[PDB]
């Protein structure tokens, strides 16, 4: 069976479209952002989520990861289509020969 | 960049003096469904998302006691 | 006590052990780089050597400092 | 299914079983897969949404040893 | 260390010896490179006629 | 008892019964050791 | 206090460690067909050449471990590659685990060299080309080095990530610190923060291959 | 002339052939048969010389 | 007690001695990449020598570790 052409229309990494569409109805498009930061504000301020050390690290690593996305990621891509595309046609170069066989023989 | 204002000058806004005669009223309708019992006829999904909703305000809520203080995580003192 | 002193002195001494790692590690890739800049087509069998020594360099750093994290936070 | 059913009937009659509750996690893990990761020309999400969700279960079971942290007192 | 409190031992070991002997292995032995197509085009060995 | 025979051993047989043999002795070692270790305490 | 990230985890009184343990083979997927998605299209490829770095070296009898070192490569370095994120219980800073993982495959490279290649594997006690006069106490330093073997494998993995992660965690601390003192100090500490965690990275996955490439010679040399 | 509509019957399965997205390696093994892996001169994961690999 | 503490104090010493074994098995394997990038066909005796060298240089670790496991847990 063949394969959707796509995923699933996530944004930031973390968010799939799904959510905005489903409290723009009843809250706007600036709705999930409120959302999103008034959570943020309660959860740092009553303190739910200690800011330590484990925040800087955290930081750290996730700079290291968007910037490794937002570097290196457009070759892997398109490195997987290549090999993909590279596949596909070695196979069908083995199609052909094999035909040219048969009508030969 | 500069749609954050917009968005923010064209949603998020304290009530205008002409709308909190709209606000009052609106208050008078819900917690009339309440005195009904209409809010037992409300299915799954407007009820969490007014449930959301007062997640939000009660955020704002949040929020307006740290402009008290202030200072963000717990008390300056 | 004198018990958790000579504990700290002694985790000292054995953490200076990793001194022979550090230098060991620091021969490892500069002979890699000189055997590199000689031959630079044996790459994966000079960086498989490369891995190969490293690792016994840090496996030898290694147990000095667990006897470091041993005789201190342990006995 | 749930988000169409709004009675306690529905609980009371989904199975319970062993059988049940893995038939149940392997139907969520294929609807994932099919859903984010097993498409062509697909993209990292499918990938950095399982680890922020391991993220915050790690999170949460590494609390109780957070809480003994806390910046302020109340 | 906590390392060291060997009374937890038993819940690391096992459900590695579990995915690592195991489940890993699976999600290997289910992984298979096929050969290439190597479509000959030459293999035509019929006769002669019996002249 | 079916499919935990199907889809988990018979794919493995090749490897548990005939290379892994040794692995097994080595981990009976390893269950001596632990067993020993956590005994010492 | 410290060495809390390295606690045995448990959630609402249960076991959750057994959680983290399976979870990295969930992180492959595996598929019948041919022209498949690019994650599994990335993740064949990365197998492909693990296998034939690794087991390239062997003759065939060495060659049938093929299945079981790259499965262990694969799980080992996926389960480091999970330590890095925070607030997580990495399974190999553990020494139990790991001693798990090298005294099983050890002892059974060792015992398959002794079954067969039993004349030529008691004969490797000793290098041939040594003199006389102490060929004997030579052998007893290669005894004592071949029963070292075990230990220091589980021991090379254990501390590379514990200290790695101590490391790390310890700078947290010390930019937080300075995070209310001087804030140009603060962000060097933080740069020194962040090419810590590249080299973090580059080391689990040399510890992986590392303790791979060790268990594949000891097997090497042992069939 | 046996051999010549054998050789044909042949041509049709090979031009008959599912699009290769949709191919499993099942599949691919029966439309080409030199791709089957030799499970018997290699039994073993990953069942082929670890050079061809 | 004082005893106890000294044997910690000299156990930490003895196995200050490890960074030697761990520096001559950085040199060894240095050298082995060398030697092989410069002759890459005598690949078994390179080797064989190389495990020598390793051995002789564990062999000298060993006895240091084992000097510090001698007078910390059994003198």
Known sequence: ?105 | LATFWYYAKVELVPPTPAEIPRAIQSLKKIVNSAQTGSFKQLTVKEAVLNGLVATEVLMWFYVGEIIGKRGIIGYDV | DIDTAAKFIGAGAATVGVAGSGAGIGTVFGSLIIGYARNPSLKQQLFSYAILGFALSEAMGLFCLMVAFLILFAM | EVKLGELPSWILMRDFSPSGIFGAFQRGYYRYYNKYINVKKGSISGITMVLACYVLFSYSFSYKHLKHERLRKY | MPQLNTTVWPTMITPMLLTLFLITQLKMLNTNYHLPPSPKPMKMKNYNKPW | LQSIIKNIWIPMKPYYTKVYQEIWIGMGLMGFIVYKIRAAD | NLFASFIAPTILGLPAAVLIILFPPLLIPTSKYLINNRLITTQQWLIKLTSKQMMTMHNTKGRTWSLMLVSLIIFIATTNLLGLLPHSFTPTTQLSMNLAMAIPLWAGTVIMGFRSKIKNALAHFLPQGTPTPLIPMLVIIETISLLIQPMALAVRLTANITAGHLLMHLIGSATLAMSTINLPSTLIIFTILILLTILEIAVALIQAYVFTLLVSLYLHDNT | KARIVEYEKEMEKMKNLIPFDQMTIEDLNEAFPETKLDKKKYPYWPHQPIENL
């Open chain 1, 1 to 105: 069976p063949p394969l959707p052409e796509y995923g699933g229309k996530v944004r930031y990494g973390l968010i799939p479209e799904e959510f905005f569409q489903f409290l723009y109805p009843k809250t706007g498009v600036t709705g999930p952002y409120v959302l999103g930061t008034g959570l943020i504000l309660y959860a740092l301020s009553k303190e739910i989520y200690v800011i330590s050390a484990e925040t800087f690290t955290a930081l750290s690593v996730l700079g290291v990861m968007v910037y490794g996305i937002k570097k290196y990621g457009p070759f892997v891509a398109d490195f997987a289509d290549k090999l993909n595309e590279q596949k596909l046609a070695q196979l069908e170069e083995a199609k052909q020969a094999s035909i040219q066989h048969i009508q030969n023989a």
